[PDB]
């Protein structure tokens, strides 16, 4: 396997500074790791901040939950070999599965 030299869309990236993460009913924080032995050199992991969901008033409602949204990413590490890493990109608010027998 030969790895062609050149990366499409190398410049396009997503800002984690939109505070979409704090305006969410299922807010989350971020964490970074720097590794020169892989590309991208930086990987951003998300961590749901609460177990329940928040409303506009600021109160936690624990009948519903913040849960993580996860994506398999490709990152290559070095002589170059692909690696598959699991990334939490953020959280959403869900209501549990409640069947009809209470």
């Amino acid at each position: 396997m030969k790895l062609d030299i050149g990366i499409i869309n190398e410049n396009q990236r997503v800002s984690m500074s939109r505070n979409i993460e704090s305006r969410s009913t299922s807010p989350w924080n971020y964490t970074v790791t720097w590794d020169p032995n892989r590309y991208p050199s930086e990987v951003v992991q998300a961590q749901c901040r609460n177990l329940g969901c928040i409303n506009a008033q600021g109160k936690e409602d624990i009948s519903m939950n913040s849960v993580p949204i996860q994506q398999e990413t490709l990152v290559v590490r070095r002589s170059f070999q692909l690696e598959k890493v699991l990334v939490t990109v953020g959280c959403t608010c869900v209501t549990p599965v409640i069947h009809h027998v209470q």
Epitope: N29, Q47, L51, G52, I62, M64, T88, P96, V97
Partner: antibody, heavy 125, light 108 residues
Framework: EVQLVESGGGLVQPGGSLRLSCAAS????????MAWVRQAPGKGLEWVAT????????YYRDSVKGRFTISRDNAKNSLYLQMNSLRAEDTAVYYC??????????????????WGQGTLVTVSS | AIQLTQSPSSLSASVGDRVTITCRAD??????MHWYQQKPGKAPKLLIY???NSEIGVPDRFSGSGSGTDFRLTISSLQPEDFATYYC?????????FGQGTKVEIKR
């Protein structure tokens, strides 16, 4: 990725003492609360103790209060359980337990996403 | 302390059957119910968290449901490797508690 490796079990006489250790790796040990869970032969799971990430607070189950002491180093990435005044009812496999990597460790009521392999503690004369 | 009670304590089902374990609590633990799977001589593995969410590696045939005091773990098509004891757990009240265990055996 998350690995918890326990050591320090074995045979001890009643009233004796024993120090369990849990070597953590694969996560930011200093960010998450740790716990010990026990399980007596052929029985169920039973929470023993919890310590916070900074080290400031320790919660115990009534049975072991005053006798057990949970501790952490945070620099050697290690959790400890000092067991004193051991009674026959403490015979159990002791598990080290870690919370999920994808939720903030400040959350107290988190579950046990990762478990160590367990060491047997046998208290017998 | 919230005491949890799983029903049944043991069960036998053929490969491919739908298996259902229920876990009932003294007081309401409000979505803070989790499930574990323990195979013999191994530590417990997490299966379900917060009633109905599962960890990355958990097969799709395991699912959780429930609300307040009545929760349920479901195996939609029992497999041979699913022989184990399943435990519920609540993290609502501070003495964290486990069910007594449900032992799942395979009918062949």
């Amino acid at each position: 990725e998350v690995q918890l490796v326990e050591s320090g079990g074995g045979l001890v006489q009643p009233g004796g003492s024993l120090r369990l250790s849990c070597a953590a790796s694969g996560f930011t040990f200093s960010d998450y609360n740790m716990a010990w869970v026990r399980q007596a032969p052929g029985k169920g799971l039973e929470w023993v103790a919890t310590i916070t990430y900074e080290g400031r607070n320790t919660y115990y189950r009534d049975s072991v209060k005053g006798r057990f002491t949970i501790s952490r180093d945070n620099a050697k990435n290690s959790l400890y359980l000092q067991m004193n005044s051991l009674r026959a009812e403490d015979t159990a496999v002791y598990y080290c337990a870690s919370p999920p990597q994808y939720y903030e460790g400040s959350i107290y009521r988190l579950w046990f996403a990762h478990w160590g392999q367990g060491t047997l503690v046998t208290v017998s004369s | 302390a919230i005491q949890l009670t799983q029903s049944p304590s043991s069960l036998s089902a053929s490969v491919g059957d739908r298996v259902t374990i229920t876990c009932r609590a003294d007081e309401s633990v409000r979505t803070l119910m989790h499930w574990y799977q323990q195979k013999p001589g191994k530590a417990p593995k997490l299966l379900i968290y917060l009633v109905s969410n599962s960890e990355i590696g958990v097969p799709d045939r395991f699912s959780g449901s429930g609300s307040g005091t009545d929760f349920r773990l479901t195996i939609s098509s029992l497999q041979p490797e699913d022989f184990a004891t399943y435990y519920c757990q609540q993290t609502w009240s501070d003495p964290w508690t486990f069910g007594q265990g449900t032992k799942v055996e395979i009918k062949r």
